[PDB]
Design a protein around this ligand. Structure first.
Ligand SMILES: *[C@@H]1O[C@H](CO)[C@@H](O[C@@H]2O[C@H](CO)[C@@H](O)[C@H](O)[C@H]2NC(C)=O)[C@H](O)[C@H]1NC(C)=O
Ligand SMILES: *[C@@H]1O[C@H](CO)[C@@H](O[C@@H]2O[C@H](CO)[C@@H](O)[C@H](O)[C@H]2NC(C)=O)[C@H](O)[C@H]1NC(C)=O
Ligand SMILES: *[C@@H]1O[C@H](CO)[C@@H](O[C@@H]2O[C@H](CO)[C@@H](O)[C@H](O)[C@H]2NC(C)=O)[C@H](O)[C@H]1NC(C)=O
Ligand SMILES: *[C@@H]1O[C@H](CO)[C@@H](O)[C@H](O)[C@H]1NC(C)=O
Lengths: 97, 52, 49, 261, 104
């Protein structure tokens, strides 16, 4: 399983931050113009239309990956290993062969 | 092995010892922040907040 | 390929390298809202389960 | 070792806070984790449990954020429900462990200091199929043990962690008042920044009450800039500083192997 | 007293008209519902799918009287996907609902 960690969007108030591309798996980068964020009290950015927001998300391994994970393998010719119980007269013993 | 400014102090024993957070919250959060990637960070978090 | 088995990929359990094509097409925020919309193919591992 | 001192509850957009009206909630659910094959769900909600506003570690209190101040409520008002009244086991920090009947939505709620309920609902399938080859509802008195994986109570032990960062800002209009053609900015003991475009007014930060003469409320702006506490990286509260300055915190309840009847 | 106060719920017992606490009111189809507009003989509720509908209120004796009717109530939200709760990102599509205007 994966977890798609997405940090808090940078919202550059009256300025333009073009997205800087740090190589991380399935990293998806975009800077949007014309945003107008509204936190609870009111608008976080004074400037009417020149706000921008840089929204970025990337995918990483889930925190349980060590525990629940399917492993893909390639199988070559196999080695048989058996337990044989053998008996003659009074000798009765089992061995690994 | 945690780097604050130029301190390069060992992560066990904080430069602000004792009660780092009680002295300067903002500075402590910065000090922790600067050493996020350091493999020893959690010696810094183990030292930094807790105090008597 | 996204959605099917192998959406995430990793050589070993502890390996750092990682390959993912989960189709993270992040979209434009709705007006008057802080958020980060992303439409993503759900995990292919649950589909495989 | 109260790593929760640094942390603070946050006000997080919650699309369905009961009655179908979107609202900015103290309890907004931000992640549901269901890797436990037992059935327990780890819920990530915006307001820590068991770390009172004075940062003592007492457990009867659930700490949450309103306005800018941090208030507390009674633990026993916590209710989680998917289709029926769920059952909570684990509470520390932002994480609540719940076993829940199958449903389609997932609600968390706590009572305000003013004894009003505040909840958040999110769309989560949650059709638990218990391990083994039979879909049983509750465990029998006789059966086999198979390994289930579930979340324990051991508050700490590495690997699993979240990202914290500095609270971005908190725009408010409470601090602005109009005193006869002047704008009076109260502070209430918290660092406050202002951008008044009334000419001379200028931008700046203060720690004490002041005012700007000959200016209008509708023309200035104000936001309180806390830096003492720390917050979750949550997509619904914006960032504060380019390229991200992200601190880290251990999260309770790791998963491990238990016998599953 | 025919005061328009909201905290009180009016009902009839015997031949007398008594009142009870407004917060008593409970609507439930399968689970607890949520009431939006409570005015007059009419109560607006958003409710989860079920098969019955029960409305409940306490007396002056604090004894719960409630009553139940059989109503299908499988609401299908508008559009082309049946969702349980509103998403945080999505389109706006016109639904028709009841508002609180007593007026005109
Ligand atoms: C449950 O127990 C197992 C072993 O008792 C834990 O360890 C893993 O077990 C698998 C079983 O084949 C091995 O392939 C892994 O190499 C083991 N991991 C390690 C680090 O030794 C497992 O971590 C436990 N917890 C779970 C599965 O959640
Ligand atoms: C030969 O040696 C084995 C080693 O103990 C004897 O044990 C038998 O093991 C089988 C394993 O399935 C059991 O079903 C038997 O009940 C065991 N025997 C006894 C007496 O308990 C085995 O019996 C020996 N063979 C003979 C013919 O005596
Ligand atoms: C304070 O707010 C003002 C605007 O309310 C910011 O100044 C400029 O606003 C105009 C409005 O059209 C923009 O065209 C400019 O681009 C803004 N300035 C800059 C540098 O881009 C001002 O920046 C705000 N205060 C601070 C400290 O940034
Ligand atoms: C670190 O060293 C540089 C080298 O000159 C110095 O300029 C700087 O002030 C030092 N850091 C602090 C916090 O003084």
């Amino acid at each position: 399983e994966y977890k798609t960690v997405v940090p808090s969007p940078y919202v550059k108030c009256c300025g333009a931050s073009e997205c800087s591309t740090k190589e991380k798996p399935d990293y998806q980068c975009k800077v949007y113009t014309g945003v107008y964020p509204f936190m609870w009290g009111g608008a976080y950015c004074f400037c009417d239309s020149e706000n921008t927001q840089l929204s970025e998300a990337y995918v990483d391994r889930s925190d349980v990956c060590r525990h629940d994970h399917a492993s893909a393998y390639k199988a070559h010719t196999a080695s048989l290993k058996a337990k044989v119980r053998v008996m003659y007269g009074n000798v009765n013993q089992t061995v690994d062969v | 092995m945690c780097v604050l400014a130029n301190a390069t102090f060992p992560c066990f024993q904080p430069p602000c010892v004792p009660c780092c957070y009680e002295n300067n919250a903002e500075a402590t959060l910065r000090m922790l922040e600067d050493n996020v990637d350091r493999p020893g960070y959690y010696d810094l978090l183990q030292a930094a907040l807790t105090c008597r | 390929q996204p959605g099917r088995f192998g959406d995430i990929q990793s050589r070993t359990v502890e390996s750092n390298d990682l390959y993912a094509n989960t189709a993270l097409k992040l979209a434009r925020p709705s007006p008057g809202m802080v958020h980060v919309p992303y439409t993503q193919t759900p995990s292919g591992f649950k589909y495989w389960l | 070792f109260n790593v929760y001192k640094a942390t603070r509850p946050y006000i997080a957009y919650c699309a369905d806070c009961g009655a179908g009206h979107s609202c900015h909630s103290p309890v907004a659910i931000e992640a549901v984790r269901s890797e436990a094959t037992d059935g327990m769900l780890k819920i990530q909600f915006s307001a820590q449990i068991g770390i009172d506003k004075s940062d003592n570690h007492d457990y009867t209190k659930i700490r949450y954020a309103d306005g800018h101040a941090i208030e507390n409520a009674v633990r026993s008002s916590l209710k989680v429900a998917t289709s029926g009244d769920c059952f909570v086991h684990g509470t520390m920090g932002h994480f609540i462990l719940a076993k829940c009947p199958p449903g389609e939505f997932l609600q968390v709620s706590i009572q305000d200091t003013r004894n009003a309920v505040r909840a958040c609902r999110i769309q989560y399938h949650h059709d638990p199929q218990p391990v083994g080859r039979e879909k049983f509802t509750i465990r029998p008195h006789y059966g086999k043990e198979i390994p289930c994986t579930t979340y324990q109570q051991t508050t700490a032990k590495t690997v699993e962690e979240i990202d914290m960062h500095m609270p971005p800002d908190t725009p408010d209009r409470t601090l602005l008042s109009q005193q006869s053609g002047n704008v009076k900015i109260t502070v209430g003991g918290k660092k406050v920044k202002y951008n008044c475009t009334c000419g001379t007014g200028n931008v700046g930060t203060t720690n004490s009450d002041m005012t700007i003469n000959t200016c209008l409320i509708e023309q200035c702006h104000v936001s309180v800039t806390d830096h003492k506490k720390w917050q979750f990286n949550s997509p619904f509260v914006p960032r504060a500083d380019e390229p991200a300055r992200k601190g880290k915190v251990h999260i309770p309840f790791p998963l491990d192997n238990i016998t599953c009847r």
